[PDB]
Amino acid sequence: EVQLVESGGGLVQPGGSLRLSCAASGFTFSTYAMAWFRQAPGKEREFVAESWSSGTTYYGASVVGRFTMSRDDSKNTVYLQMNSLRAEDTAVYYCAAKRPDAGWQTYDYWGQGTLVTVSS
């Protein structure tokens, strides 16, 4: 079955940086959109970033200019580079995958997440 596996979570101080990665298999990676979402304690899941093999990449309003996402289609891996981290970036971060022929909010596959804590 499809696997999406996040790596890289942990504790970072405010102002620090952290890079997450997500390894994908079991579906046609090159044609899907890959995305990062996050869920802060007790809140609804929030869009973070999305990237297509065409190069098109875009971000949530709260993170644009601080986070960057990249994809390595040759290695079935995506990355989230998080800079200038803030306490309110604390969340479980999830990788997700979306078919090119699905509605723009329909994500078929979800990783199990990685915890990121930003605290002094």
Q: Where do the domains of the chain lie, and which CATH numbers do they carry?
A: 3-118 (2.60.40.10)
E-strand stretches of 17-87: 18-25, 33-39, 46-51, 57-59, 67-72, 77-82
Among 16, 22, 17, 20, smallest CA distance to 8 is for 20
Among 97, 94, 100, 101, smallest CA distance to 109 is for 97
Phi, psi dihedrals of residue 89, rounded to the nearest 5°? -80, -5
Measured distance between the N- and C-terminal CA atoms of the chain, rounded to whole angstroms: 40
The tokens for 30 are 């090159």
Q: Determination technique for this PDB entry? A: X-ray
Amino acid at 65: G
Q: Answer for the pair 72, 99: CB distance below 8 angstroms, yes or no.
A: no
Reading phi first (left if > 0) and then psi (alpha if -120 to 50, else beta), residue 66 is in alpha
Q: Answer for the pair 37, 52: CB distance below 8 angstroms, yes or no.
A: no
